Amino acid sequence: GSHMRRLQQTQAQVDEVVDIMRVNVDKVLERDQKLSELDDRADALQAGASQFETSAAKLKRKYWWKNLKMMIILGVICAIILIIIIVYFST
């Protein structure tokens, strides 16, 4: 009687659920392909970055020394003019 109604509707409900969970699975699969692929760039950008961190790390050193040079070569030149001076102050 009134329990043969529960069956009618309590079923279509589940139908609805699984029908939905069907399309949900097809989304969790696009998630796979979109993710596993992004992960291929997570590496390929931790490597594009850590290889530019090398180029950059060095671009600092090499740069740096040319400032030391030009304060050593301003030291000898500030000393050569100093001695080229002790020689026209003397005779």
């Binding site: 969790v28 950059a56 671009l59 030009m70 301003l74 080229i84």
Partner: protein, 98 residues
């Protein structure tokens, strides 16, 4: 006889519902699986990014220190080139005065 064909049709569907609920049970365990399984696949995309974010964070700060010493070298280099031409006319006067 008539109430034995109604328990036969009610039971007949209580299993048609139980066999259908198991299918939905699996749909939810087949979900806590693929999601949580991809949960290991995300932490690696976070780990890789938080490092790749940090690599760029330093990699740019160095490009800055790496333009400072240029004007500082350039100065210290032409300050030399100043005291160079200076030395050439300080020695071109011991040739213009024997």
């Amino acid at each position: 006889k008539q109430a034995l064909s109604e328990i036969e049709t009610r039971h007949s569907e209580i299993i048609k519902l139980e066999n259908s609920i198991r299918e939905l049970h699996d749909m939810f365990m087949d979900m806590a699986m693929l999601v949580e399984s991809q949960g290991e696949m995300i932490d690696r995309i976070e780990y890789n990014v938080e490092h790749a974010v940090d690599y760029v964070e330093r990699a740019v700060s160095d490009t800055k220190k790496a333009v400072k010493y240029q004007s500082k070298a350039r100065r210290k280099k032409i300050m030399i080139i100043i005291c160079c031409v200076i030395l050439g006319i300080i020695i071109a006067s011991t040739i213009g005065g024997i």
